[PDB]
Symmetry: D2
Subunit: 497 residues, 4 copies
């Protein structure tokens, strides 16, 4: 059979002639019989002194932890990032310091709305998070398979996600929720167009691109900074599943993406992605026709060419999924010297959200979990204690800063980039920023006739279940992007209605 199916057989074969280990309780006490409980006589009641039973059952009763609030369904793999080009003129980050430099990486792919147990081959964006274990600590590039997103302000994120998930009363998917939100928030037009196109359902994780999406900031050795976009293109080529094949596969194999990735790596077909960056100077940022920090916008390639940096290669499968994949945590705020945040409101919100949700989902000391540990860096600070403190807790080192006793010292070279911002400190409305121009270019130039047809068919197929008033407003938005876009969807809706 395939490698995945033969997991146990292979584990057995590796043991070879070795005698089985002694079965023990959690406290390491050998177990005499773990197949029958202790009772008063053959047909008598169970005894409390059967600690073997309680020890095992109590742990079984505690196996589950909360699934991720979004991107719950996924797959993971490990490998490395290798620098192929010199971009030190832009970033001083150690991960990019020299051509040929390899940094270990951990990756998790995922859908967005579905819970654990949902199907892999469904229309939804795809998470493509990368953890770089650098000497300057971990760098988490928490990307998606799209360069943009549905909204441009983080305060609408919980609402958007709610609208994409289950109705609070019925617990069912709700087309009224989905489309009422999107039609009321037309900034979503760009990503909705990409979502409903062919790339809405990639053929597994190896056949899609990855993007940082947000504009980030790079700082060099001289303290000079530029803005950038991260891109990682699949070396296996873009490949998508038709709506029909995706539907069939969601029933035949809900874990299609997990299986495909595991088997590819197990057979030596290590997937790779070519890593690039787009660079925009501060001067160019002032002249960009849109807000360069607006997540619903892309930086046109003809104006901001992709610059090659390196390669991402996945060549190792997880040994224990729960420990290495379910428990892995990526924080966009994990950025080493040379890489910083941009003023993108969405990115700014994410700086808070991830460590926050991880403290809840995993625990206060989630960074102690092996897969999350910045193992290629010495963690030395003034943080102590907390639940499940699994390391030496920094021993007897002086726990306050500053101190006259030789404890860890701050490193001035690691100081962040200083910038002057103008304007009042308040809430600035961005609902009316451009919501259609780049979407028009996508519909007209990025897609061809047959792709536009499928796009309209995909949208109408889902939108038809929303109330007419919602259908009307959604169509009004599409029409504003392009009359052909709106009219084609309307014609399909008429047929359905």
């Amino acid at each position: 059979r395939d490698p995945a199916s033969d997991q146990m057989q292979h584990w057995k074969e590796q043991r070879a002639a070795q005698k089985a280990d002694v079965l023990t309780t959690g406290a390491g006490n050998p177990v005499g019989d773990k197949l029958n409980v202790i009772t008063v006589g053959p047909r008598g009641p169970l005894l409390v002194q059967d600690v073997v039973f309680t020890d095992e059952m109590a742990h079984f009763d505690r196996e589950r932890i909360p699934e991720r609030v979004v991107h719950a369904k996924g797959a993971g793999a490990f490998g490395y990032f290798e620098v192929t080009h010199d971009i030190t003129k832009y970033s001083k980050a150690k991960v990019f310091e020299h051509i040929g430099k390899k940094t270990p990486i951990a990756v998790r792919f995922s859908t967005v709305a579905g819970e654990s147990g949902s199907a892999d081959t469904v229309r939804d964006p795809r998470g493509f998070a990368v953890k770089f274990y650098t000497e300057d600590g971990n760098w988490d590039l928490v990307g998606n398979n799209t360069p943009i997103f549905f909204i441009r302000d983080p305060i609408l994120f919980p609402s958007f996600i709610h609208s994409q998930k289950r109705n609070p009363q019925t617990h069912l998917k709700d087309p009224d929720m989905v489309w009422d939100f999107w039609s009321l928030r037309p900034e979503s037009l760009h990503q909705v167009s990409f979502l409903f196109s062919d790339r809405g359902i990639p053929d597994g994780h190896r056949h899609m691109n990855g993007y940082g999406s947000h504009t980030f900031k790079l700082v060099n050795a001289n303290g000079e900074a530029v803005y950038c976009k991260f891109h990682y293109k699949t070396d296996q080529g873009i490949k998508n599943l038709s709506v029909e094949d995706a539907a069939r596969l969601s029933q035949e194999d809900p874990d299609y993406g997990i299986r495909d990735l595991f088997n590819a790596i197990a057979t030596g077909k290590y997937p790779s992605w070519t890593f690039y960056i787009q660079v925009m100077t501060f001067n160019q940022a002032e002249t960009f026709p849109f807000n360069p920090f607006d997540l619903t916008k892309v930086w046109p390639h003809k104006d901001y060419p992709l610059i090659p940096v390196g390669k991402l290669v996945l060549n190792r499968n997880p040994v224990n999924y729960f420990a290495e994949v379910e428990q892995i945590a990526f924080d966009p705020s994990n950025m080493p010297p040379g890489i910083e945040a941009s003023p993108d409101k969405m990115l700014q919100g994410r700086l808070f959200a991830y460590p926050d949700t991880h403290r809840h989902r995993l625990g206060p000391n989630y960074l102690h979990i092996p897969v999350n540990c910045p193992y290629r860096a010495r963690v030395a600070n003034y943080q102590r204690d907390g639940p499940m403190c699994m390391q030496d807790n920094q021993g007897g080192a002086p726990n306050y800063y500053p101190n006259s006793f030789g404890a860890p010292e701050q490193q001035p070279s690691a100081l962040e980039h200083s910038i002057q911002y103008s304007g009042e400190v308040r809430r600035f409305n961005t609902a009316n920023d451009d919501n259609v121009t780049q979407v028009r270019a996508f519909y007209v130039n990025v897609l061809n006739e047959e792709q536009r047809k499928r796009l309209c068919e995909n949208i109408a197929g889902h939108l038809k279940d929303a109330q007419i008033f919602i259908q009307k407003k959604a169509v009004k938005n599409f029409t504003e992007v392009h009359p052909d876009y709106g009219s084609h969807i309307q014609a399909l809706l008429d047929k359905y209605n």
Copy 2:
């Protein structure tokens, strides 16, 4: 559209002609703008003083709680239990005190192995838990849609569940795990035969029966006791889904069971079940040909006739699914005077497991969550504090027993029934108890030729993916039940292989 689809529309209409509430933070502070965050100028970074954002995001980051270790995918409804017959000669429980007596109930239906985003229409047993809010506290009859189970000793439960779930490394379903366990533990033959028959995939929750499965004990007003089995048969009739339709539905509508139940209740088609009991005297328990407390055995209806008791009616849908369904907790140990446990090893283990897992999944004070509260009884005791103590914690009442200050007193009439047991206190092996006799009767008499054909096809369709040595041992067990059972499966496996 259907009621479920129109949930929001109906909520809106109910409010109609009245102003929307003021949007507030969790602390009740009115929100001026919850659509834009506070930034340093229109293109500057986010401020910590945007508490509206953090307050909302922090809660979003904490929405998820651990799903149930088993039976994670489900649907809920509410209604009542009504006594139709007098069984006070068997049980003094207040829930049965008089004909016509109505007791409010809460019910949750579910599959077993699949996680929260899995499909409803798959082969698996179905949970059918009933919470009776009685004057003597809550009585939780945590049943399944089958009168039996796969194993007869609780220490094997975690292992059985593990074998039914995901491979620890690949995170994929594993036929080797499933069948290695079942073939090595032939006591599973009886329930495996039922599982792979037509009733393995019921047409929604309204078309299946419910059973307490375990033998329980009933105690009357005179202190006399008998053993019993609880049965609740569908008044809507047994109806199943073909493998083909179940497969199609798992893709078309993974929430088929949830939708079906909600819409039935919303349209006034309240589903009901006729509640019965079988009674076995202590004398009969001594002469029963098998262990009457063996969960892999049924009490033949010819020898132990069904005695009608009342009816279960579900006439109310949940208003908020998370609060009323995801958070509901059923403990088999919640039994009021008149109903007690039997020596069934499986039941004995469950007495511990449920409250234990609930303290983890929900929290130490999970009984304080509205849907879990014994609202028709006054909780008065010496228990105090704990996380999220959401009631006045019994005020200033003396917190130790005994006391001379008028605090709660034990009630002699609530004392449990006493039975004498003799024998060595040790682990008694039950692996070699009868594993085939009742299974033969099911295969030969309960099923007919066409049903036996489908049973063998369903088993072979799944078992064919397990290694040959596993298929062989499995077939050996089936052959022991009946040579036709094993040979038919083998013939089908021969084709597949």
Copy 3:
């Protein structure tokens, strides 16, 4: 005896004409005998079916929750706030709406460094937090018994607290930690001077003042803003305990403050405080000699006169301490319209810290705990679920914003005050702001000779246990405040050494 001692006797008497409640399990099942466990025969082992035992023991095993990271030892009480003067020209907050308007309040007093079982009468600042349950949600004024604090930047807070607590290895109080930090961070001179003065150990909670400490912002109906300080002076008069009496009481009655407050309220001696504010216009903020938002500075009374506002009255004792006091949570970020944060770096950090620690200490849904509920306001928003969701979770109301289904709407009038700030976004050092001027005024003008004598004796009595190099550095700081301050301390240290 005193009211506190007679708590149980009074509880008993209050229900003399009633029979005791029936003792039940957590699920409301009546208990027959809660004085003996179930065993097989008189001297046989314990049975798992003794669910009465497990239910009670399991809850006992979960009684404790984490104590507050700081201010762990405290006392609580309830009452009201009454407006007595009109300050609507400064703040539009509903709590100040009309003279005569009463608002319910909850208060918690506490020490700072000591854990839960520590003594009340010890040198340490005193917490004086006030929760106002207003119609515009809860307003939490989390003050101390001092107008200033030891540091002026929140990032040094964890270090400061660590220095004040136990050595990480020995778990003992450490004078080297205390004074190494204070001597290296001389901005602490002002509050250290207050701390070691006679007011360092107040005679209970009723004989001390309360202050918001931080500069806050008030906004009126016209959108005009001013900066303010909150002061609440004791109507019972300032009264302190001598070092000797405090030491004796810490042994005789570690709960002196708790007992004193309870008995005063129980005997009708309701303690009260007169509430005032200081006002500083934005223009005055420009001319202030120091940073008006520097927490180590006060606003001189002659320059900024106290303006009376109202009264704080405590007239109700807690019924259950754990539920109403141990579980109470105050968040400085809970500010209703009309009251806002100032740029005080320390306050800014607290905006994040409290809700954050509360989600940990109490739980994600801590605002649903009765005492923390903004019961005078209707909480309506788009937040849902989370562990121990204790209400109907807002039912079936649409859960995303914006929506076309009548769910909660934002209120523009509640929009925050806009301000333009100048300067780069970076880390500005404040270690070198003035650390001695206001301290000199306190030493020279506020204190008299005998008070200066005790201040020096109190400091020297503790500082004498720190290493000589730490003593030298500390004295150097005190000398900069005033040569007598340092020399008197040095003279005493020479004596101790």
Copy 4:
């Protein structure tokens, strides 16, 4: 100064020849400035992008975990147990296999009622828990400084502890609660007598004995069993503190016990205890005049002589108290082959309670915490996952038992000892077992007149604050032990009242 005081100085000196480590965030990113936060200009608000601040503050906000429900205040140390005599004829436990065999141990000493922060030198029993890291897993002998306890049934434990702690309304110690419980439950007479004697306040942890208290069962290589009692007598000699000195020290140094133990070990004065066992054959258990499994009874030395076994030596202090002491967990149920529980109801209850409370206080995977790890044993089983899974989670090993893939196997030689029982499974009352005989022997034969006088004085000094009716019932109990015991106490009470 003393070693404890010079902790930081020594840590600094040990690293004199090294540069300080680089201060990093939790994720290992170097910190440029951890003394000032990022603001909008020098007097502007705080930015969310100051991740250094949030990362540190969020951890500070989560430092605390629930303190132990009982025995919260303590001290810890490490060392070894060395076998000096051969008791293999009684027990096959590997910890006793041969003379000269050393097993690493971890010890925690403590008081009982006081919270963390309470004083060490107060009247209360003292915990003396010993963790033996053996090849057969961990063996936890969770003893006290007394051979007996206040009660003989575990269901009264939560009540007893409640009566010993704070009043639920006032949060104060309550003499009425303490004595109402003790007077109503006279089985407490024996331990109350020990508690109020000179040994009620030992001079530190090194000057007191340790006892397993309960009767345990020892099983040898031939499967033969005997009952036993564990005793570990101080080699430093019994030394107690007077009521006066204890009171003064409770104020001068609440951490007297912690300091004393740390300095003793730091200076090379390693404390030791001589380990003994008492042996009672099953025949003798049948003839014992009292219930040999009654926790309020001792086995007289003349009839059951102490048999030397080995030595407990503490020669290593904790490096980090929180990690090694606050987080240490002892489970009485952690018993290796050769050591088993007896029918003692109290012990039976503790088999459940400890692992249960640990899953709450520390977490589901608390056995993963370094100090709790059975590091001298290979943990191999079918347990998986759970929050904070800090190990490899047993990799890809088959997770179900039985299995055909070479995973861990039960060890028949680890099977527990079988004993036959016969009796009703019910609640047998033990309130009326002998409550005075052994107490009389203590009062009359063990103590002298000088000691009896202090015993009566210590009791009366506390009992005087309980109501008169409680004083009378308590005195009636003491009178039943001996008329002089009651009359002397009554005389002192008369003087006090």
